[PDB]
Amino acid sequence: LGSMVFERFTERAIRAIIFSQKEAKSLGKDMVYTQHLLLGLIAEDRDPQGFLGSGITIDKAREAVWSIWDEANSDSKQEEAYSKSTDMPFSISTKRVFEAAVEYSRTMDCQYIAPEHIAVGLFTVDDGSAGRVLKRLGANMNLLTAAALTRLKG
């Protein structure tokens, strides 16, 4: 995407990002926080074995998210202050993740930022939101990070 901020992001990565916006909107949100990004990544991944081969699926992930943030008290950490769904802004935590993804990709001497780089970012530099969802799903976040790194090897 030439001389865009997302120029080096792959087609898959961009799709996951757009999906994060859609997922957030479905939940009645006006900004994409990191749990939403997690949803976008899950929605995007076409692995037949589920997200990062984990058996996680989007419907289950969506239930978890709704439950955690919407069925009881709201999250004090997510009150940061759009005419179509792809104009929905990203939270400071989410932006941090994207920056981490870029950094990791550069460190690895990769030409692109893939969803896997975003996942590594998500699972290393976020506000704890992704972890809460994974915990609810019974998943091990560090194993998922490893799986993402494994994918990037080919």
Numbering used by the authors: 75 to 155, 160 to 232
Task: Give the article text.
The domain is made up of seven helices: α1 (E85-L101), α2 (T106-E118), α3 (I132-D144), α4 (I170-M186), α5 (P191-V203), α6 (S207-L215) and α7 (M219-K231). The crystal structure included two molecules in an asymmetric unit. The crystal structure additionally shows the 26-residue long middle loop to take a different conformation compared to the 14-residue long loop of AtClpC1 NTD. The presence of longer middle loop and the absence of a helix in the stretch corresponding to α3 of AtClpC1 NTD make AtClpD NTD very different from any known Clp chaperone NTD structures and perhaps might attribute its functional significance of having to recognize specific substrates during stress conditions, without the involvement of any adaptor proteins. When the structure of AtClpD NTD is aligned with AtClpC1 NTD, we realize that the long middle loop comes directly over the region which may otherwise contribute to ClpS1 interaction.
Here we report and analyse the crystal structures of AtClpC1 residues 94 to 238 and AtClpD residues 79 to 233 (hereafter mentioned as AtClpC1 NTD and AtClpD NTD respectively) that correspond to the ClpC NTD of eubacteria.
